[PDB]
Each structure stands twice: as C-alpha cells, then as structure tokens.
Design a protein around this ligand. Structure first.
Ligand SMILES: Cc1cn(-c2cc(NC(=O)c3ccc(C)c(Nc4nccc(-c5cccnc5)n4)c3)cc(C(F)(F)F)c2)cn1
Ligand SMILES: O=C(Nc1ccc(OC(F)(F)Cl)cc1)c1cnc(N2CC[C@@H](O)C2)c(-c2ccn[nH]2)c1
Length: 429
C-alpha cells in the first residue's frame, strides 16, 4: 500500500531520494536487511531509510503515537512539556497493551487503554470508541475521566537510528575530500579525534585519524565497529582506509562526554527522570553487547557521549575505581566485570559525576572490597537503584545480575510511581 514520511531525509548518495515529513510514497522494494527501501514520490525514485516512513494504514502516522516506549521513557518525553502534553504508547513486552501518558502540573499521569469484548477502546467505561484515533480525538476536547484534556502531542525530536549512510552491503569506504576537518575534539582530550562537517551527507562528524607513532589496531577497531549496531552504541558512519591518513567516522555528539555533562548541566532540567533515562539507555546498550558476547572492558561515565534530547551512546576512547576484584587480582575480564563497572557508572549518575570512593586511597580499595566495604547510598538515591548497584558489586562474578536482568529491572522499577517522588522522599528522610 501507500506510505507517509515521518521524518525529513536529505538525498546524499547518488541512489538516494530526498523526502519531507508528511509526503506520500510508494514502496518498490527493500535492501539486504530491510533497513532501507526503494521509494517513489512525485519528485523522484530512490533509496530512503525504512524507519523514516510508515504505511498510511498504521498508528505511527499520528504525532501522539510513540509506539513501544516505556513508562519512564514517556516521563522523559513529557519532561519538556506543559499541561496537556501527551502521548500514546504500547507495552514492548506485552503487545497490544496501550497506555496514555499525560502531563499535568509537573507530573505525568498514566492510563491504561481498555479493550471491550466487541473491540471498542476506552479509558472511561461510558466513552467507548471504535478506533484509537477517535478515543484520542474525544479526550482532546473533554477530559472525561482524565486529569485534563489531551492537547499537545509529545514531539518525536530525534531522527531514527540509521547504521551507516548507504543502503548497499558493506559500502563503508567514503571520499576523504567530502569532509572539511575542523579543530581537535574536546581540546585534544581524546587524542587524534577531530570535529568535521560532512556537507554531502548533511552531518557534523567526529573523525579519528591515524598518525605515525598502530595500523593493525586502527583497522581492527573499524572492523569491530562495523558489527556494533544499537541505538545507544556509537554507530560507524564510514572509513577512509585505502591511503593515509586513515579515518574512522561517527556522528558528532553535541554535549560531549557524560561525566563532564553531569558535572556542568542545569540540575533543574537534568532531574531524576532524565538521569534514569540516561542510565536505562546505557543498560540497553550493555544488554546488546552481552547478547553479542562482547566484553567492553572500559565502562565509565567518561566513555559515554551525550547528544540531543539526552540521547546517550556508549563508546570506547585511577581506572581501579571501576574495576571488578577478579580483574584487579587475576586480570580476568568478562561481561560480569562490565556489570561491576556499570554499578560504579550508576553511582556516577546518582551523584552528578562525583569521583568514586571519596577519601579512600587507591592502594586500599581491593582490601576494603574484600572486607565487604561498598560505597554508601548517594544522597537522594532511591533504595531500589542502590540495591541494583549492590547487586552489580557482588564479590563473586556469578552472583552478579546479567545485563538483560539489569535492563528488565529498570523497565519494571517505578511501574506504580515516579523516580521524582522516590528521590523526594529520600531527600526528606
Ligand atoms: C578493537 C575494538 C574496538 N572497540 C570499540 C571501539 C569503539 N570506537 C569508538 O568509540 C570511536 C571510534 C571512532 C570515533 C571517531 C569516535 N568518536 C569519538 N571519540 C571521542 C570523542 C568523541 C566526541 C566528543 C565530543 C562530541 N562528539 C564526539 N567522538 C569513537 C567503540 C566501541 C563500543 F563501545 F561502541 F563498543 C568499541 C573495542 N575494541
Ligand atoms: O536525582 C537524584 N538522584 C538520583 C537520580 C536517579 C537515580 O537513578 C539512576 F538510575 F539514574 Cl542512577 C539515582 C539517584 C538527586 C537529586 N538531588 C541531589 N542532590 C542532593 C542535594 C541537592 O542539592 C542535590 C542528588 C545528589 C547530588 C550528589 N549526590 N546526590 C541526586
């Protein structure tokens, strides 16, 4: 059938098609993995990312329909809202289960959408509708059981994730001259990493360059990155590995590293909901690396990048404070030692980037960990979050939760409350 564009896409490659949000398209076919599709508009024919469009006969065409988003992710999306800001979401775990998340007087209210035996949808038993768009349209005029009216659909601000810049199989080599190299990133903090502009592809990029005094390591890094495909792990955009200097390209992350971001942010804007949103994106990324059996070895807030709308990406650019005991004693690294490091990262988030083990000499850390000493619950930290850190910090690696269990815990943690209320109580008690 017919499709509608949900996001703007600017033609870059020769086989690509420029599209505007709201525009109709006919879909001719798909690329090797279904992530790109060949579409036809009134302006032409060409390749577009599949997730930038949706059938005209689908719920995703509505600005208020955010699809599979969690209770907590909905609270984040509405944190920038006003009274009447709202969205409709589906449960990822239990398909077909929908809810309304509505902002009123700085709080988010969640309502289950009920289905009758004849298939009619309702929030209030007296007001049943044949379709979801009719239910939404009704509660957009009268509250009729909701705290207030549904007036402002929450914006879908971040563009969907696209792995690379091409629909074609293993086309990663790009043209060096198409990038205008600017200054070194973060005032030389990351080494041979530069800010660049990729005009052809309409991107601001971060470019890692190879200079004399290891080619084999730089090539292995590009090769590893080709297989890392998750919305919260840095996505490789392309390489220049034919002639020197060798390039590795990713999209530039506006707000730099997470550690400095936590330390320098506006704490009124970056509240408990925003902090939980960032921790959950990191846990999703680590669940993905766990499935791939990939050992990160360097998980810390300093190794995470912050983009627009608090989009967090795990990357890999004193470290004793993040290191598991078996790794310190026997140089044994595993997914379970990444779990330990995640617990410390959670403590960095819970404190707005404080340095771990305050007042403790680095030479005494292992000895203290052995006697079952652990960092104290940060001030304002909800007990359930501190229990998770304590689970990550189990002496024995096999006693530690897996990243799939950590992610599941976050998504079922404040299922009948708000982390903002939990933090409020801990700051009071
Ligand atoms: C052999 C091997 C590779 N890896 C691995 C490499 C990376 N690469 C980068 O993070 C990386 C590579 C190239 C570039 C250009 C960058 N970009 C970068 N680096 C430092 C700072 C910034 C930056 C700073 C401020 C604003 N925006 C970006 N960007 C990252 C990422 C991963 C991970 F975490 F995703 F699993 C794994 C591990 N073992
Ligand atoms: O929101 C807070 N914590 C939180 C959020 C999410 C969590 O979950 C996770 F999953 F995101 Cl890690 C876990 C903990 C928070 C609020 N206020 C704080 N203050 C104390 C006095 C005041 O001036 C500033 C602190 C704080 C700063 C330094 N230490 N403590 C933290």
């Amino acid at each position: 059938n017919l499709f509608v564009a949900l996001y703007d896409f600017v033609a870059s490659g020769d086989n690509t098609l420029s599209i505007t949000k709201g525009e109709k398209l006919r879909v001719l076919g798909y690329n090797h993995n279904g992530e790109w599709c060949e579409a036809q508009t009134k302006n032409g024919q060409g390749w577009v990312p599949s997730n930038y469009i949706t059938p005209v006969n689908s719920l995703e065409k509505h600005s208020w329909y955010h699809g599979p988003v969690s209770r907590n992710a909905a609270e984040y999306l509405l944190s920038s809202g006003i009274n009447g800001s709202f969205l409709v979401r589906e449960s990822e775990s239990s398909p077909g289960q929908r809810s309304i998340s509505l902002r009123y007087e700085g709080r988010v209210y969640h309502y289950r959408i009920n289905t009758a035996s004849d298939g009619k949808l309702y929030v209030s038993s007296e007001s049943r509708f044949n379709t979801l768009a009719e239910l939404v349209h009704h509660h957009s005029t009268v509250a009729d059981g909701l705290i207030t009216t549904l007036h402002y659909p929450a914006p879908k601000r971040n563009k969907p994730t696209v792995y690379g810049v091409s629909p074609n199989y293993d086309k990663w080599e790009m043209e060096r001259t198409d990038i205008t190299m600017k200054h070194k990133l973060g005032g030389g903090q990351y080494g041979e990493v530069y800010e660049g502009v990729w005009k052809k592809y309409s991107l601001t990029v971060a470019v890692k360059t190879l200079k004399e005094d290891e080619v084999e390591e730089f090539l292995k890094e590009a090769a590893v990155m080709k297989e890392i495909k998750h919305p919260n792990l840095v996505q490789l955009l392309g390489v220049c590995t034919r002639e020197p200097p060798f390039y590795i390209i990713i999209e530039f992350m506006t707000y730099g590293n997470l550690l400095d971001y936590l330390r320098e942010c506006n704490r009124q804007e970056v509240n408990a909901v925003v902090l939980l949103y960032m921790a959950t994106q990191i846990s999703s990324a680590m669940e993905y690396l766990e499935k791939k059996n990939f050992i990160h070895r360097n998980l810390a807030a300093r190794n995470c990048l912050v983009g627009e709308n608090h989009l967090v990406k795990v990357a890999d650019f004193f470290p004793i404070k993040w290191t598991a005991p078996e790794s310190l004693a026997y140089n044994k690294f595993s997914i379970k030692s990444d779990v330990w490091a995640f617990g410390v990262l959670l403590w960095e988030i819970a404190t707005y980037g404080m340095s771990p083990y305050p007042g403790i000499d680095l030479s005494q850390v292992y000895e203290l960990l052995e006697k079952d000493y652990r960092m104290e619950r940060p001030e304002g930290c909800p007990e359930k979050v501190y229990e998770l850190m304590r689970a990550c910090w189990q002496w024995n690696p096999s006693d530690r939760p897996s990243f799939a269990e950590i992610h599941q815990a976050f998504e079922t943690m404040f299922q009948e409350s708000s982390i903002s209320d939990e933090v409020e109580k801990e700051l009071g008690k």
